[PDB]
Amino acid sequence: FPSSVQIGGLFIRNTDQEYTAFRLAIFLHNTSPNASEAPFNLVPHVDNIETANSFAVTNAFCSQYSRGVFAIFGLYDKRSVHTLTSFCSALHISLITPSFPTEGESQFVLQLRPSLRGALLSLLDHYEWNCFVFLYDTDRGYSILQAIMEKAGQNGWHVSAICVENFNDVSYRQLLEELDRRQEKKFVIDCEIERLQNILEQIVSVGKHVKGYHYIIANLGFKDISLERFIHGGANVTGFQLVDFNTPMVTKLMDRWKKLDQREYPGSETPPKYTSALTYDGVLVMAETFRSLRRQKIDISRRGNAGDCLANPAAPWGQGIDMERTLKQVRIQGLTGNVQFDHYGRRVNYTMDVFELKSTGPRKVGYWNDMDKLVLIQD
Amino acid sequence: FPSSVQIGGLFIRNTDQEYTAFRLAIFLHNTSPNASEAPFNLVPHVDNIETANSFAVTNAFCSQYSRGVFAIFGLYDKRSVHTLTSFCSALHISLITPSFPTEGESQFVLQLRPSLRGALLSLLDHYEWNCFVFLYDTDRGYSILQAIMEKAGQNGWHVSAICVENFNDVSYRQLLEELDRRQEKKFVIDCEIERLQNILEQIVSVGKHVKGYHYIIANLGFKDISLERFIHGGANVTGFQLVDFNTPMVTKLMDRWKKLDQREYPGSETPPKYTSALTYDGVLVMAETFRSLRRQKIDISRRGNAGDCLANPAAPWGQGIDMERTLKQVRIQGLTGNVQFDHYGRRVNYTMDVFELKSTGPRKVGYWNDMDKLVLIQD
Ligand SMILES: *[C@@H]1O[C@H](CO)[C@@H](O[C@@H]2O[C@H](CO)[C@@H](O)[C@H](O)[C@H]2NC(C)=O)[C@H](O)[C@H]1NC(C)=O
Ligand SMILES: *[C@@H]1O[C@H](CO)[C@@H](O[C@@H]2O[C@H](CO)[C@@H](O)[C@H](O)[C@H]2NC(C)=O)[C@H](O)[C@H]1NC(C)=O
Ligand SMILES: *[C@@H]1O[C@H](CO)[C@@H](O[C@@H]2O[C@H](CO)[C@@H](O)[C@H](O)[C@H]2NC(C)=O)[C@H](O)[C@H]1NC(C)=O
Ligand SMILES: *[C@@H]1O[C@H](CO)[C@@H](O[C@@H]2O[C@H](CO)[C@@H](O)[C@H](O)[C@H]2NC(C)=O)[C@H](O)[C@H]1NC(C)=O
Ligand SMILES: *[C@@H]1O[C@H](CO)[C@@H](O)[C@H](O)[C@H]1NC(C)=O
Ligand SMILES: *[C@@H]1O[C@H](CO)[C@@H](O)[C@H](O)[C@H]1NC(C)=O
């Protein structure tokens, strides 16, 4: 087994913090005082691309492929998910990603991000929502939209779905205005953080951040966002929190996170978002995987592969099958809790806290896990 | 100007008829008795691939790119739209496609298929639908879904959206059953032809093909499908028909179409579907485009380009800009009527007939064009 293991790093636009987390995890691994933890070094070959279109991601993949990576830690969006996952499976180069889960690809894709679908639907039931509007964007695909619209159709919900991509201050006013005329009181928001911040501001500019309005934020990082105004406005706001900041592992990470040079490690100036936590865990998963391969006595090597992604015929890495099988057997504790997978490479046996906004600030009102579903606190 | 022009042909799964149309148009061009029509020959370099995943489409593109094609006539689906359009724009190789329109790509993509969005929404208004279910699949993206759900949210429609991908006879029964319990009477169906045929059968097995049920079929080929049972059942069925079979141009095509050897030209056994008509027009558009380039005295050549799609830096074809600009200026008559485009490469100044199902069979009840919108017949 090699003393150095080559892995790919494929990051896209506005993922500075995630890359900072990637770098920290790798540093902590390579400088570990524990020979058992680090019998090999991780040598990342990284592309940080700002466009993230399909052509550029394909070129990045092929560049990493020719540099002989055994696996790729990679992010994608709607525009690149298909090429990246397709090239990975075709060539048996395992993809480890913190990006939105995707059912299509079923081999060579390990999806660190657990599904929010069940939790979100369970929540809507508990609250007995029947008429609400769904504000959203499509950067992370259409799964949540489809899940909501299907649940709505089977339950006689009157849901008004509205895409807010490319809305300006005017679009919103009009949007928030009409909304005002219909007297919409309940909302589910599913957007990128940047867009989320903006919508929330608009709602506050509108004065619908007061009681009694209710907002459910459909993401895994309730605490990643500033809700000060809503805490003061008095509106209901519910969300999910995958990362538990009151645990030793997260605490220890935070201890180091706060000491990072914010100029050299952009994104360290704020606490890690859930995507950054997922990225850190991804490195933990890869480290465990290579330790396992080593125990299995599988001397991973890509010699003497041509290194050409467009080679005809395609020449898939023969040891890729072992890598992929071993990845999915990983079961470790991470920033995002129990990290464990099914054969499709999807997270299973996981939990997330459910938070509500109270005067005192965010308060935990329960949790959701894939075995018990929604469990609220009660005396 | 070369006497032979190299073009790409990228066809995916179950596109036999479309390729048959492609071949016929090219044959009719190369064997034209008219020197003005054919001052050059069209030399297609074709890939007919059965999987149609992103890896295979990228490899096909690169193979055609290295064979020195000036443009590519290509089909895609949700899985390949991004790679194909991305590679085309990056390398200034114009894509001419009959596939579902896509707003993202704004250069080097000419979209032969006109939008159905306005027509469909106009239709729902005319009929004053407020409560209906939307049966659909996602092979052609989510535009129609989004358009419906947004229109619904702004108009207080109670729409129940249901995706039917991967439904079997059991899924449908349950589906059609529950539907029965809710007493759903009105439906919009937006699926692939194969899936459409199947749903329609299920509905007939259910007995909801009678009066008074209403079905709106959201596609451009009302006549492409067998509705015999519904003609007899007595249900309302409305749809759109882009190709006018009672015109000299279509008639002449049909004259030759029916004489095709159905073994050598699979798909000729039935009348051309609207996608096949679009494919034929695509060749007409390319022929006109090359005739225009010739008049402009633009001696198109890709010498001595490396021919490597993954070349760094990317070396876009310098004459690609002219090709792309000229494509979009094309204005000709085709099987699908007036073929004309805006600078985004989208169809404009087009019309489609609106058909209803009557005892006598399909009867035209009006039309929709992008200037007049919905115009119904009335005494
Ligand atoms: C605001 O959120 C509170 C959360 O407490 C909602 O009240 C809860 O509703 C659930 C389900 O209806 C009950 O099981 C809890 O007992 C309720 N808690 C309390 C303290 O009342 C409330 O419905 C929401 N109100 C609005 C206007 O959105
Ligand atoms: C869910 O995950 C936990 C680990 O986070 C699993 O608990 C472990 O189970 C093993 C047996 O396989 C015990 O030996 C360990 O002591 C447990 N660790 C704990 C409790 O921290 C649990 O088995 C998983 N449940 C599933 C997969 O159904
Ligand atoms: C079935 O379709 C017929 C189409 O004629 C519908 O009747 C038309 O409705 C439109 C708009 O309401 C009117 O402008 C036409 O004058 C109507 N035509 C006729 C002949 O009545 C009818 O509403 C549909 N019925 C059902 C049950 O779906
Ligand atoms: C819509 O398309 C038709 C062609 O199908 C255009 O009609 C032509 O207009 C030109 C002037 O540019 C006339 O010289 C031709 O005689 C017309 N051909 C016909 C009527 O068959 C029409 O201009 C287009 N309208 C638009 C683009 O607004
Ligand atoms: C050393 O690393 C191995 C593998 O990660 C682990 O089992 C062990 O607990 C570590 N030892 C210490 C002292 O942390
Ligand atoms: C010959 O082709 C040119 C260009 O397509 C066209 O303008 C002309 O009408 C054609 N002539 C005949 C007789 O069809």
Author numbering:
A (entry chain A), B (entry chain A): 2 to 380
Anything the authors wrote about it?
The iGluR family harbors three major subfamilies: α-amino-3-hydroxy-5-methyl-4-isozazolepropionic acid receptors (AMPARs), kainate receptors (KRs), and N-methyl-D-aspartate receptors (NMDARs). The ECD consists of a distal N-terminal domain (NTD) and ligand-binding domain (LBD).
GluA4 exhibits interface characteristics similar to those of GluA2 (UL interface LD: 43.7, LL interface LD: 37.2). First, we present the crystal structure of the GluA4 NTD, facilitating a comprehensive analysis of this sequence-diverse domain across the AMPAR subfamily.
